[PDB]
Amino acid sequence: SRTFRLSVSTLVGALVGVLMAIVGVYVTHSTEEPHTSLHEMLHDAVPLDSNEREILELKEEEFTARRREIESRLRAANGKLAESIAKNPQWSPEVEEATREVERAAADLQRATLVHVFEMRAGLKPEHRAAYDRVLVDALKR
Amino acid sequence: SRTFRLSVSTLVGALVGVLMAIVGVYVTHSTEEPHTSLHEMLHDAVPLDSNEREILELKEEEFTARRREIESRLRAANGKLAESIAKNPQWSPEVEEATREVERAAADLQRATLVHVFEMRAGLKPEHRAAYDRVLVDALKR
Numbered sequence: 001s002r003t004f005r006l007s008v009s010t011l012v013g014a015l016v017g018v019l020m021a022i023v024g025v026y027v028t029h030s031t032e033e034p035h036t037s038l039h040e041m042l043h044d045a046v047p048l049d050s051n052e053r054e055i056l057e058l059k060e061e062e063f064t065a066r067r068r069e070i071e072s073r074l075r076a077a078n079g080k081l082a083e084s085i086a087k088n089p090q091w092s093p094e095v096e097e098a099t100r101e102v103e104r105a106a107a108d109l110q111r112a113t114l115v116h117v118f119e120m121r122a123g124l125k126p127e128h129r130a131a132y133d134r135v136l137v138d139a140l141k142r
Numbered sequence: 143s144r145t146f147r148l149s150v151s152t153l154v155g156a157l158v159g160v161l162m163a164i165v166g167v168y169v170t171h172s173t174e175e176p177h178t179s180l181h182e183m184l185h186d187a188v189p190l191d192s193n194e195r196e197i198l199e200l201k202e203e204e205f206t207a208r209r210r211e212i213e214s215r216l217r218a219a220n221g222k223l224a225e226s227i228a229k230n231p232q233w234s235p236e237v238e239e240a241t242r243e244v245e246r247a248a249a250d251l252q253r254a255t256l257v258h259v260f261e262m263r264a265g266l267k268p269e270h271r272a273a274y275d276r277v278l279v280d281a282l283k284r
């Protein structure tokens with residue numbers, strides 16, 4: 001027996017890190033892609049005669065920042081999972097916790113996008129809110 | 143000089159298979175987990191004094207069926223991607239198509255869950271719709 005396992009585990013660690021990095025890119029796309037189309041949909045269908053555009057653009061910049069910080073937390077959670085499997089490559093309490101922590105960051109990204117979507121429609125004049133709701137139904141169903 | 147490439151490609155194959163396996167698990171969880179909690183949340187917070195329970199249970203059974211069929215399409219799309227890279231391990235038209243097909247199945251799963259969620263609240267008495275909306279805000283934000 002030698003430091004052979006102490007380098008095989010390091011490989012397992014590095015390998016899971018890369019796997020996670022890619023999955024993480026898919027996670028960030030599975031949330032941003034629908035939000036981007038929904039944003040273009042808002043500009044094309046809903047007006048701004050009381051200049052809600054002023055308010056909305058700030059709200060979006062605030063969201064992109066929160067999005068960036070959850071994204072960072074997800075890279076760190078994946079990193080702690082990569083490092084924990086590099087210590088003990090099995091379902092230990094260390095991995096159990098590190099996995100749930102990845103699931104949480106991924107969920108908190110999807111939840112934050114979802115709250116932003118309703119936060120955006122909140123900052124709209126009732127006349128426009130009805131038009132925003134009517135275009136949501138028309139696009140999701142068809 | 144040897145079947146070295148015929149085992150390097152097999153590594154590429156196995157590696158993409160693991161990537162896909164994880165992505166797939168994330169996809170099935172990113173949709174089911176919120177829906178399950180949202181369903182329990184409906185039963186605990188919203189009543190049924192006009193027996194909407196009768197209607198809703200049928201709507202859910204119809205959804206679980208559509209969910210099962212999109213889920214099957216996603217396993218088949220991942221399978222055709224696994225088999226195509228096993229033929230030519232590069233960005234060929236075969237892979238180009240098979241990848242877009244995986245993306246579509248994943249999106250169609252998330253979209254179907256989302257439409258179901260609004261389809262469920264549609265079949266509710268206005269008195270209950272307001273209670274269902276008030277509990278959604280309280281749970282997502284906090």
Ligand SMILES: C[N+](C)(C)CCOP(=O)(O)O
Pocket residue numbers: 096
């Ligand atoms: C070890 N354990 C089985 C009790 C908990 C680990 O979580 P899970 O594998 O049941 O999701």
Ligand SMILES: C[N+](C)(C)CCOP(=O)(O)O
Pocket residue numbers: 233238
């Ligand atoms: C747009 N497209 C995916 C159909 C073709 C573009 O080619 P490629 O950039 O995927 O190689």
Ligand SMILES: [Zn+2]
Pocket residue numbers: 035039060116117120
């Ligand atoms: Zn937005």
Ligand SMILES: [Zn+2]
Pocket residue numbers: 047049127128
């Ligand atoms: Zn107007």
Ligand SMILES: [Zn+2]
Pocket residue numbers: 054
């Ligand atoms: Zn101004």
Ligand SMILES: [Zn+2]
Pocket residue numbers: 039043057060
């Ligand atoms: Zn904008």
Ligand SMILES: [Zn+2]
Pocket residue numbers: 103171175
């Ligand atoms: Zn979970």
Ligand SMILES: [Zn+2]
Pocket residue numbers: 177181202258259262
């Ligand atoms: Zn439901």
Ligand SMILES: [Zn+2]
Pocket residue numbers: 182183186
């Ligand atoms: Zn309950």
Ligand SMILES: [Zn+2]
Pocket residue numbers: 189191269270
């Ligand atoms: Zn009632």
Ligand SMILES: [Zn+2]
Pocket residue numbers: 181185199202
């Ligand atoms: Zn039920």
Ligand SMILES: [Zn+2]
Pocket residue numbers: 029033245
């Ligand atoms: Zn895409």
